[PDB]
Amino acid sequence: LYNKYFSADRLHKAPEILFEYNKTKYDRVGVRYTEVTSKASERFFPKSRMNRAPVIEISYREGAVSTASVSLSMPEISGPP
């Protein structure tokens, strides 16, 4: 029983801080309230990092080494059926 301090209407609720900052005249900061949500797997796969995988793209044509390039990112990716 925990209802004396943490009643069920405000249970598991925290502020969140957001930043619209790009060194711009329109740069903002925001504060909101939220219900928090987390699940089990985030001891090793944290929410900012979860399900992100490094994709590599290459442009090359045979003999065109001066045009060849490579790039790297890691977005959110899903499986194609």
Next chain:
Amino acid sequence: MKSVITTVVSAADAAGRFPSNSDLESIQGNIQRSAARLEAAEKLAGNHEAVVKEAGDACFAKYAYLKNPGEAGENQEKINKCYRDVDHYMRLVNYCLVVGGTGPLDEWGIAGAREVYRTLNLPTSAYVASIAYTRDRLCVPRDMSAQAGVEFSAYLDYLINALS
């Protein structure tokens, strides 16, 4: 000779008028471009015994069937003719790098080429292979400057579109 000066002079002569501002500004652009344009021409003059040599064997590397009997490269003298005709095209590219426009190519290399290469049964794509091999061999910070390289490949690309 299609160049910057001949264009505006022929336009003023067809109109029967004196040279105005629009003709002199075009010569100003030639003045402003000659520094980057003549940079590629002197290095093509200094490197040509290597560049047509190592561009000619790329043609036979892509098309090894040309050295078969009954083809256009059956003996050594026809291969010497092939390196001859490659060096001629490189000399014409060096010429249009000097003039400013594409006068020497469409006067001496391009006009009438489709008749000769058809009746003498020379494969047209084998020329485009040797030109396109030298087009992407150019790395821009090392051989030329950044501005000489684009103005060198634009004539090479022009030849490719004319032959294809």
Next chain:
Amino acid sequence: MKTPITEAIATADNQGRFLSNTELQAVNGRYQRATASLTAAKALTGSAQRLITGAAQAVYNKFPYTTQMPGPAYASSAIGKAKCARDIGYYLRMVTYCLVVGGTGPMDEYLVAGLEEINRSFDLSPSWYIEALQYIKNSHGLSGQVANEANAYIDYAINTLS
């Protein structure tokens, strides 16, 4: 092709009046429902081949005389199954288009128009496609508001087919 933006234009153009607040709220509601429709369209795109093969198998189970009757209209031979999977792919594609634009406009001009004489002259029964759509409506795996947005365009086609 009619989306909620297009009738907002079409009403103001009737007297040629300027766009007031009576039309801007109508497009604002499209912008409200746009998120719940777009993930429905994305999830239906991700589930295309599974739903198409399951729907075709549901029609073959519920109407077994379809793959056994000798005739060009039936799926008894191998190419009839290709035509039958092609049709269900067309239906699911129109459903995803209507989910994207937020209105029944795509299927109203690509499928609905002249779908009566197509079923009548080529002797196709409309009751097959209702079974195909009733398979998709319950087994697409979405739930809640996204599924409620997705089911409306699905059983809209059930309504015009019946």
Next chain:
Amino acid sequence: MKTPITEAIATADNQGRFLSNTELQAVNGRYQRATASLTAAKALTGSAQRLITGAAQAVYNKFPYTTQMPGPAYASSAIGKAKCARDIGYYLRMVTYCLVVGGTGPMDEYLVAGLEEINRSFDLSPSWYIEALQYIKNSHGLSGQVANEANAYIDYAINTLS
């Protein structure tokens, strides 16, 4: 009388199609703006006599000849001031009605239809009512998402008057 619900009905009735959520989003956006329009209508109701007398005094200040000119069209006598306050009360009433239903439908059928020959035959100048409405548009007190909803119907009438 057009509100965003009425064109949602009128578009579906043209082919006689059922109400899919092409139009349900259009009425959902009305339900979104409804709260911000209703408190604007309530606050404009609460400020009726102050705004009417201030607007009439603004017209009498900006056009002092209307207080002096001998004629039936002017407010030089006592009953002309009663007609002039009655007209501004009519305008504010139509503004509150359009704020309530969420569309310009009330004033479109009660006010502006046939207003041209009213101003022409009875020799009233439309520039008086623009000053009366420009008084209400800045000195109503409303500010924010509620004043932006209230100002649109106010300067809509400025647009048709001019």
Next chain:
Amino acid sequence: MLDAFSRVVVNSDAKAAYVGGSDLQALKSFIADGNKRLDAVNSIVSNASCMVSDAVSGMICENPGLISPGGNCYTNRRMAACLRDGEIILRYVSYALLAGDASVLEDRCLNGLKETYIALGVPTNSSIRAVSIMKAQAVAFITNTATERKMSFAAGDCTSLASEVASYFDRVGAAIS
């Protein structure tokens, strides 16, 4: 302007509020060393999820008895609740840094938390170990001495951020005690 931030929490309505221009200039004028404080709270909110994950894995790889059957982290849904709790504590201490004041840290999370964990049978010293791990990660992110992670800042010293959040994490660790 900080009263507008407090208003949100007072109302608990989950509707966002934003400051910029003259309102953000008033906030940065009012609360001490604002620019540095902003790089500070950015260095927390961009690293928060890895912080609670690394913290609870450090607690578990120190004491396996919670992951044993009969442990408080066993039957993973509770372990999800523990991840949630650690992240909530992180969010409140990040706000308390951003405010330069520890009042809401008392009033909204630390008020009556110890008795709650006693009533639930939550072991205290493991959570003290967890918040000390978060304190070390926070001061590492604030000195830009993360061995694994790099952000570019305008050059200078930020003594207050490490001592400020160390005082705040010690307030949490003493209030749970």
Next chain:
Amino acid sequence: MLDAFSRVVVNSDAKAAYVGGSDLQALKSFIADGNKRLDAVNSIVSNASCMVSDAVSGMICENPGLISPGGNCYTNRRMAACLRDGEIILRYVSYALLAGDASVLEDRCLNGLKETYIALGVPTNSSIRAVSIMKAQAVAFITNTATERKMSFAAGDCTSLASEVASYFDRVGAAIS
């Protein structure tokens, strides 16, 4: 060039790095046999989607119990997530080949994955079968002995690539075990 690629992984920011000819020559000067180490990762990224599809269909046509009701691949959600997981593992092992080093393969996917699959009830041996199928497809694509698929390469031997990715796939298959 190398520092930017490292910072993309360290930040996890999902923004693409991009490189010029002088940049590419610097990374190729750092890398061992970069020229040949590039045809390899190209032969993976041009074949990746068919690889995970053929892998999961080979697992399913070996063990149908996952597609039976009560199976882990049954339901609309399970099939989509398992395809996603297998492709993620493929992308990380492709990076680990491109780097010539298996550190991020540990740190970003293999760290704590087995306990996650235990907590979700994912059967391990089926995923081991899957990654062995991907290992066979990878070494087939690297010897250019794909019976169905052809790319032209500059002529020569690339034995190290077959052994490099076999060591990496065995690292995955042992770390999940």
Next chain:
Amino acid sequence: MLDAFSRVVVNSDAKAAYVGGSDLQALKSFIADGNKRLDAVNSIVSNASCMVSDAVSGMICENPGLISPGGNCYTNRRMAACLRDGEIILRYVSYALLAGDASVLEDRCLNGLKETYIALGVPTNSSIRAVSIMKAQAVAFITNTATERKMSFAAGDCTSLASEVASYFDRVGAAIS
């Protein structure tokens, strides 16, 4: 024909107004990005031949009724006339991109093309397809995102120029529609 300059002169001549500093700034901005404009027309006309060849063959390979007997692209003569029909519109689009105005495009090429095509019996749909596939190659060559060929440039983006050449390519598709 007019230009990025003669356009504002014909606009100012209706006013009988001098070209003052208010509307000269668009012309100075047009001059200040002239090097990117020349860098774009060079990139288009260097690959112009493969553009028309790939465009007409891509129009054919998704509508094989044109090369069907009696189709509009059936014999060698009709196919050569189509391959030149496309080259002419690419030439006039390049003129309009160099001049910065579509006035050379609309009267020298588009004035009367519609009734020409429906006097010849040319299908409109394949012409919009061949125009759209050329627009897709032009926007790839200007922004240097062409897959099979990359050209070297300076740093900066040309979405300006890409949308200008896209509007030029939609003008012809609207004219022959």
Next chain:
Amino acid sequence: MLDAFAKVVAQADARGEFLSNTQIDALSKMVKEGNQRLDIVNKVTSNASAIVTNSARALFAEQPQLIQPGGNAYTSRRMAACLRDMEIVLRYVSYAMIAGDSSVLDDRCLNGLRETYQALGTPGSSVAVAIQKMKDASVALANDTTGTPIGDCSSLVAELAGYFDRAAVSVV
């Protein structure tokens, strides 16, 4: 008609495959500026008469020969004929603004307007000047924030000017 959403559906269906995953967030950014697009349009709608009348008064202040006896816009029917044309091109620009693409503007307004002006003898390049006189009055009015939260609308007013030049060059 075509709006900005059906545009992406059109060439996706003409290519024949589904919408890709990077186009859906290109549409979810497009719904992100929605509230901003409504503030813009509503700005140009509420003072639509004042834009037309001030642009016409500035148009005749520099070109009297239009109001000259014998000029094109001289008689009261011919003077009224300018104001309706200016309100039409203001109206279809505001249609294209909320639509997100230019396809409805050149469809019902700019299609063949050059041929009508070349047939009536209405000269070509003051309707261009009138459209430019309306353009600067519109994008100055879209900049006003008085009655809206503070932010960036400049990408959308670039598009709003990107409709007016399209209207201004299909009439010369």
Next chain:
Amino acid sequence: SIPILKYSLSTQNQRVESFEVNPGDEQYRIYSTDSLPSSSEVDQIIWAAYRQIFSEHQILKSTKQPFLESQLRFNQISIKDFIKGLVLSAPFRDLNYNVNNNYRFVEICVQRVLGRDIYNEREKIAWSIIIATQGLEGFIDTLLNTQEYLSNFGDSIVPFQRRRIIPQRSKGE
């Protein structure tokens, strides 16, 4: 397809011929644009079309259709297309259509479009249906393709009430 319900006819003035070569007074000044009108006779045609369908107060400024007139003055549309682009106008839809049922609506535009009074009520029963299933526009497109419209008004004569006054009589209806 549910064709039109068969109703049966009556006897009227316009049903039988007039024998009236050279009439003078009971003729309603046919406003055709085959007349090739000038710039101000077009205004007379437009006003007479407004009087025919609308009554004389749906010639307010509010009810005016200023762009339909601009397509008439450029010969984009004809008179018949102008007529039921005027019936499709929503001032006609809220002033005349929202205030009566569809039986009275059938008679309120058979008289204004076809120029004749209804045969019986069974005709109003048979024509009330095209308002319901395919709407107002589906009603008027099927009304203006009848032989009753095309054989006397064609596509460039403004419609009018037909054979209202008998020649020797003064009164008529």
